[PDB]
Design a protein around this ligand. Structure first.
Ligand code: VIB
Ligand code: VIB
Lengths: 317, 319
């Protein structure tokens, strides 16, 4: 077991390391050419800079609002009516009790596909991810949504848990490695009601295991939160992008202890280093020192948070 | 022995049927320290947003007040307006590397005799620096003498600059009889909701203090929650009905850091039995709520974190 404090900037070597997976930070926000994409807005006040909002909105195909998130979007775009009508979500799903009559009427009038789901056994997040998957991976569902003589009866979706029932039936045959990836960027899932923050984190683990085609990343006023796969992952980033938009970072074994076999490119690199929230052994306030990449090899998947300077982001997207 | 989950009506009464209660606690005690125990209000480095009337009360309800490095700036600005109040709410200590400390803020608190301690080690968080300091303050008469003696003209109050507070803490802990240490009711502000890795660190403290400094009773107060640790094997959460109805919302059983088993719960809208819970499997009771008239029972195999939604602007009347 060891920990070393490195120089502020280095170029990591590749000798003696097995790079099993590679990922680019920018791609967490800017979806790949031909993979599906979705911007998910959860129920929490939006405060991301307007310019950045416009940018990520354009970079993503589908836009989904989680129940009360519709209120959030409506109030967020409160300085110009022409802009509010320019950014309409494709779907709004949830029990709909959180929606104000004013907001419901606005988006209904503007043809947004509103789906009601009463079940109290699934979070709005799950309702949203099930919907998003069906949208892209179920031809039958798409035909259901696009048909006339349906949108006056909840679009032909069972009121209680239809989205889950349809999702379950579909997923039974899907082979994740053969499903087109879905670049999912989520807003508002962190920093509010704490149990919701924890649930959002669980999504990073469950999706990776039960719906691997999803590539989820949370964007908050201060961080990018995503999952890193075990056994050797190389995090890549343009030097200028990193120096101008990135701050500190943290390796977070949330919900499960694990072992950090080896890291390369962090201000404080570790090897054969046990990590756990329970023991307090967690690399927090760390930071990238690798010029254009950092290597992290953990025994089990772990969560990584990368501090961002949102006001600088727009220039590199 | 079978896994079960039932949906209760909005209000029920739990019993003492067979179960075994290993710990009892009242939600109000998380904010209002008991007369016989020590208390501390810890302010971490995050913008303060708590309502003023409540702040004044929580401040009055706690003995020691500690600011974690930049937290001094936060407090200073929080009271931008009345100098009378600002002077009235001076922290007892300010500890950390102090680089983020505003030159203006540093001068103000130093002039007003706040005990400022510098610690440069980058191998411990400001949080750990604070709790070590807090324990020394209450449990080490020698530490108090070190910072109080007037013959002591050594810089930094005679505390070794790199990791003195930890060294002193470790030494004290060696001769400390934990079973006889006066409890320390610790309420923290600003440890949740900002930089995510810090939110996670704040959570580790609940587990580590419970294991290595059990005399501490830590609870986080955020704009929306009270976050604290629930000991394993049966904990009874108590609350006055009027208080619960006026200031309490939903709640969640969070197995942050390690999966466990929810042996049984009584008094939750959704009660469970032999119910495995894990952040990795996604099996986490979120958006739950109390339905027990005056109490809720939670029995887990291992300690877990509980968050109780609060309506901050309503608290003051019950504190
Ligand atoms: C064991 C257990 N705990 C909590 C809930 C409640 N719940 C879960 S998702 C949701 C809607 C908002 O996320 C609600 C109310 C449950 N059904 N089962
Ligand atoms: C493995 C490992 N990760 C991160 C740090 C850095 N660090 C830890 S506490 C702190 C000060 C802010 O809390 C800093 C910079 C380290 N030393 N070792």
């Amino acid at each position: 077991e060891e920990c070393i404090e490195n120089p502020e900037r280095i170029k990591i070597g590749t000798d003696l390391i097995n790079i099993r997976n590679k990922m680019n930070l920018k791609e967490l926000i800017h979806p790949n050419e031909d993979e599906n994409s979705t911007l998910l807005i959860l129920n929490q006040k939006i405060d991301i800079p307007r310019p950045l909002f416009y940018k990520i909105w354009k970079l993503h195909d589908l836009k989904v609002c989680a129940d009360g998130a519709a209120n959030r979007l409506y109030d967020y775009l409160d300085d110009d009516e022409t802009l509010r009508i320019k950014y309409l979500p494709n779907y709004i799903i949830g029990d709909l009790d959180s929606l104000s009559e004013k907001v419901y009427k606005y988006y209904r009038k503007n043809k947004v596909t509103i789906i009601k789901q009463t079940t109290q056994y699934s979070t709005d997040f799950t309702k949203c991810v099930n919907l998003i998957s069906l949208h892209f991976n179920s031809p039958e569902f798409r035909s259901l949504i696009s048909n006339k003589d349906n949108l006056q009866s909840n679009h032909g979706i069972e009121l209680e848990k239809g989205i889950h029932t349809l999702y379950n039936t579909m997923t039974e045959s899907l082979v994740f490695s053969k499903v087109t990836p879905i670049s999912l960027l989520a807003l508002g899932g962190i920093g509010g009601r704490f149990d919701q923050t924890v649930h959002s984190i669980t999504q990073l683990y469950t999706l990776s295991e039960n719906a691997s085609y999803f590539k989820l990343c949370y964007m908050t006023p201060t961080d990018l939160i995503f999952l890193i796969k075990k056994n050797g992952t190389l995090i890549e980033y343009d030097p200028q992008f990193r120096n101008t938009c990135i701050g500190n970072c943290g390796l977070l074994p949330i919900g499960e202890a694990t072992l950090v076999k080896e890291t390369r490119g962090l201000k404080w690199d570790v090897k054969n280093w046990p990590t756990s929230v329970v023991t307090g052994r967690v690399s927090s306030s760390n930071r990238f020192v690798g010029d254009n990449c950092c290597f992290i090899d953990t025994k089990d998947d772990i969560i990584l948070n990368v501090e961002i300077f949102v006001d600088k982001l727009i220039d590199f997207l």
